[PDB]
Design a protein around this ligand. Sequence first.
Ligand SMILES: C[C@@H](CC(=O)O)c1ccccc1
Length: 139
Amino acid sequence: QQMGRGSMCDAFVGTWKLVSSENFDDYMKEVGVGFATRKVAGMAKPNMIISVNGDVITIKSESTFKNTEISFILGQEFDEVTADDRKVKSTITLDGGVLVHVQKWDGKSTTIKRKREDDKLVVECVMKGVTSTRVYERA
Ligand SMILES: C[C@@H](CC(=O)O)c1ccccc1
């Protein structure tokens, strides 16, 4: 083995903690999340751990609502069971330094964008005209 090189995706790597959320209940309603799940999911302040190993990116979410972990290769579709229990087909790509995560299920689609802004990692969740913005800081 040799030491590999870095990548632009290294700006995302680390341990992150949710510090603010805007419009998440309305986003979840648009997605179709039911009342009790929205209430409990909306309280969570997850930690998100992003790591890279070769071509494989892993995003882990640790919370009191539901732990999740996805590992993927950019551009390559995978199966994902979301925190709210949707079974979706996901594809994650880079667009000009933004990680763009599209989830497809039941003829619906939602896009989650993750971007570095100053020392933060901003997560924008979009479902048909409804956006939620979630801001993470380094843990
Ligand atoms: C993408 C996450 C939000 C986040 O990582 O802060 C999400 C999971 C399930 C339902 C709505 C949103």
